[PDB]
RNA sequence: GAGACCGAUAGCGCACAAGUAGAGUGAUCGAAAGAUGAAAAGCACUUUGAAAAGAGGGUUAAAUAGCACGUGAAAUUGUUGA
RNA sequence: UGAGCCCGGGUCGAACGGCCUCUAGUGCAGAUCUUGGUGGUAGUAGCA
RNA sequence: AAACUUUCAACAACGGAUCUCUUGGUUCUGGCAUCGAUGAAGAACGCAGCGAAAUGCGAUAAGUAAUGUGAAUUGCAGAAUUCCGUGAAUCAUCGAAUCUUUGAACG
């Protein structure tokens, strides 16, 4: 197939609707997110 | 024969000829003595 | 004084010796114009006055120069 | 406009004035009168590099690109994850690449 | 809305006027002599420096500014005669003492709390 | 959305229209709505407003005030409602000006012009009314 | 002091003319007791100039119409009663000299007119 | 009819009684200058003052919005405090 | 580190911001810079 | 100690910067083609109840006729409109008129 869960990191780790980026960190508004942190690990979006 | 004007007190910003009564006059100021001196060293590095 | 008043454009330039305008030309039919001053050229071009005719003519164009009266009237 | 800035008549007083060498309008019983014009740092002056019409204002692009650039797009809107991530509130619906009756 | 917001309206009286065409530096001086001193006393010091028996010091705006015995009053030699501020500000004392009259308050016993001189539109 | 291209989106020619507009497109602007008994009446909505009609003012300051119209003032876009008067420094009375768009009209003073601009409005939401109904 | 348009237009010419010279006289009168007391006379004598232009526009339109019906079938006109146009609409060709046409072109049109015709998918 | 344009030192010289005021014998040269408030409701009346104006009082949500009027920086200035 | 960023208090009244890309008339201490405003000189020279 | 000079603060001044606004400008696109001896463009003098400028008009002079809408104009004063009307309006439309001195300008 062409579409992976890697796929969907790198198209959307730059820029998400749920991203918020600060000065003292980068954040995510993801219900599916655990910790609220952008991170692969954390991404529910972006996970099967 | 030609006369030199210094810009300042009643000469300075004036457009025209000053109340001097000469035939011919020029006027001066420190930009002209500048570049008369970026001349003078030109003139001399060619000689 | 060298200037007077020009009947044709109004300003106080009628040398008297020459008698012709400096500005209009006033002897000559033609009034006087030069493409070296478009300043003098838009102050002395029409829609600068009154326009006493030609702001009325669009109208009858519009309606098309009909002559008449609308039927049933006075 | 190309006449901005240019509808004046002004010529520099001169270099041995205590005066910057700058164009200054002619006259003498108005305010307008000696003040610089015709320069970019002049106010009532000209624009340095004035706008104009030739900018190139569209872009030429190959056909074969936006063909490949509008499938991609078809099967990003076929992702699932990749619509919210646009930001749909995609989640009372099923079926992602949804499709209703064309009857309907 | 006066500068010297601190005092009771209740308790003071006010007085004021705006693009007055006087000299603003002597108007300073003379509003700075009198600053502080009673209002009768004051008065008359204004109406003798008007009649030319008591001088206005000059103490900031006092270049070139000649000799006169009547210095010795305030321990300066470069003294002047205000004769138009002088007569402004008499104007003004006035206004406020009519305005503590309309109030109640008592004029015999009125000090120059505040008085400040501004420049104007030229 | 605009589709006819003689109108124009513009709000620099739509507010000099409006506030450059003759007495006539005034009065066409400073149309008011009716009341309801009017409206299940006439079958209309809107009219325009004249100086002999009774309103109630239910937007602004003046919560519900009744009253008729003593003048409509179309430089300014105002009508002047009986009794809704404010006094200056004088005492001396003024009229307050409000909005046709801010009253309703209660009363509306009959004349055949008017019977004849409520008959065409009625006539032509009649038609459309039916032709939407079947 | 109001005269209306409509009833001046149903009047002869000595009817026109003595209400007019009435009116001209009540101008002057009025005039001269106005220079005192000019106030609701202002307005009465506005109101009577208003009334003069309206009878001499009556006059006027009623002798044009009389002289446009004595000339309905002479072949010049006076100027101006002659239509105003444009100058150029003036000098251009009259419709029927404009769509003249040679006796020739008239033949090959009569007898060779553009045919209606279609041509199938 | 519009604009990935400009927004009162910008955009046409002119958003204003602008080719106006004004200057030149003349050809010609040619500006500056927008904003109270929702509504003038633009401060009744008293007192001082020759007047200008000030102090009370008043309108307003606000006069810390008074037709020297939206907001009101810097340079520069006055008073008070250290 | 910094260019800068964020908050509190006062004023104020009608729109504005963060994030990813795009775009440009995008960053000032000088240019005897342009326009405007204001200083010391100075209550001085001076007002025949 | 005070005065004078300087620094910081609060308040008050001068000034119009910043923010916000915009019946203005600039650029592009589309439909159409219409000045004048039947006296043009332009210049001048007049006309309003109270007007200086701008605007309109021309001794019928902030205007007339006619047509449509249908109850105003407005800073003040004075008249309206009967409203069950050929009829207010600094209204719109516009086919009839008036149009002083000149200006191609023509005894
Ligand atoms: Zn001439």
Excluded at chain 1, 20 to 46: C, E, I, P, W, Y
Excluded at chain 7, 36 to 45: D, E, F, P, W
Aim: proline fraction near 3%; charge should be positive; aromatic fraction near 6%.
């Amino acid at each position: 197939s062409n579409v992976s869960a890697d796929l969907i990191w790198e198209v959307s780790r730059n820029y998400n609707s749920f991203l918020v980026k600060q000065r003292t960190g980068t954040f995510s508004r993801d219900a599916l997110n655990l910790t609220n942190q952008h991170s692969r690990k954390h991404a529910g979006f972006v996970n099967d | 024969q030609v006369k030199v004007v210094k810009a300042t007190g009643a000469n300075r910003g004036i457009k025209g000829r000053p109340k001097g009564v000469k035939g011919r006059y020029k006027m001066v100021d420190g930009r002209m003595k500048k570049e008369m001196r970026a001349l003078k060293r030109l003139a001399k590095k060619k000689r | 004084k060298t200037h007077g008043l020009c009947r044709r454009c109004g300003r106080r330039s009628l040398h008297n010796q020459k008698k012709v305008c400096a500005s209009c030309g006033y002897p000559a039919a033609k009034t006087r114009k030069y493409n070296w001053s478009e300043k003098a050229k838009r102050r002395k071009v029409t829609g600068t006055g009154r326009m006493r005719y030609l702001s009325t003519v669009p109208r009858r164009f519009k309606n098309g120069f009909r002559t008449g009266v609308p039927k049933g009237a006075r | 406009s190309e006449k901005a800035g240019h509808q004046t008549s002004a010529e520099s007083w001169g270099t041995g004035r205590a005066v910057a060498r700058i164009p200054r309008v002619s006259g003498g019983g108005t305010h307008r009168a000696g003040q610089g014009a015709f320069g970019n740092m002049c106010r009532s002056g000209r624009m340095f590099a004035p706008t104009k019409i030739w900018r190139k204002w569209h872009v030429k692009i190959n056909q074969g690109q936006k063909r490949f650039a509008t499938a991609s797009a078809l099967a990003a809107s076929a992702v699932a994850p990749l619509l919210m991530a646009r930001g749909h509130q995609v989640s009372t619906v099923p079926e992602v690449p949804l499709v209703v009756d064309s009857a309907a | 809305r006066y500068a010297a917001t601190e005092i009771a309206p209740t308790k003071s009286a006010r007085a004021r006027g705006s693009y007055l065409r006087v000299s603003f530096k002597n108007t300073r001086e003379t509003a700075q002599a009198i600053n502080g001193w009673k209002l009768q006393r004051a008065l008359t010091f204004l109406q003798n420096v008007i009649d030319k028996k008591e001088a206005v010091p000059m103490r900031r705006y006092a270049g070139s500014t000649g000799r006169t015995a009547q210095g010795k009053q305030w321990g300066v030699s470069r003294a002047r005669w205000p004769v138009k501020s002088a007569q402004f500000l008499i104007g003004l004392l006035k206004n406020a003492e009519a305005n503590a009259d309309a109030k109640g308050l008592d004029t015999g016993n009125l000090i120059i709390k505040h008085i400040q001189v501004n420049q104007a539109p030229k | 959305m605009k589709v006819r291209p003689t109108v124009s989106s513009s709000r620099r020619k739509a507010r000099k229209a409006h506030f450059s507009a003759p007495s006539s497109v005034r009065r066409v602007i400073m149309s008011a709505p009716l009341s309801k008994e009017l409206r299940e009446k006439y079958n209309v909505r809107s009219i325009p407003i004249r100086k002999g009609d009774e309103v109630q003012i239910v937007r602004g300051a003046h919560k519900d005030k009744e009253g008729k119209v003593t003048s409509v003032y179309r430089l300014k876009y105002v009508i002047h409602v009986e009794r809704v008067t404010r006094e200056k420094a004088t005492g001396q009375t003024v009229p307050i000006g409000i909005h046709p768009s801010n009253v309703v009209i209660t009363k509306l003073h009959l004349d055949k012009d008017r019977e004849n601009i409520l008959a065409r409005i009625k006539a032509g939401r009649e038609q459309v009314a039916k032709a939407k109904g079947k | 002091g109001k005269v209306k348009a409509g009833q001046l237009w149903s009047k002869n010419k000595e009817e026109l003319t003595k209400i007019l010279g009435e009116l001209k006289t009540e101008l002057s009168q009025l005039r001269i007791q106005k220079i005192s007391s000019s106030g609701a006379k202002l307005n009465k004598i506005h109101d009577l100039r208003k009334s003069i232009a309206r009878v001499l526009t009556v006059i006027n339109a009623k002798q044009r119409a009389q002289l446009r019906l004595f000339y309905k079938n002479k072949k010049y006109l006076p100027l101006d009663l002659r239509p105003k146009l444009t100058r150029a609409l003036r000098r251009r060709l009259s419709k029927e000299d404009a769509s003249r046409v040679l006796e020739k072109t008239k033949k090959r049109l009569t007898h060779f007119p553009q045919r209606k015709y279609a041509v199938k998918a």
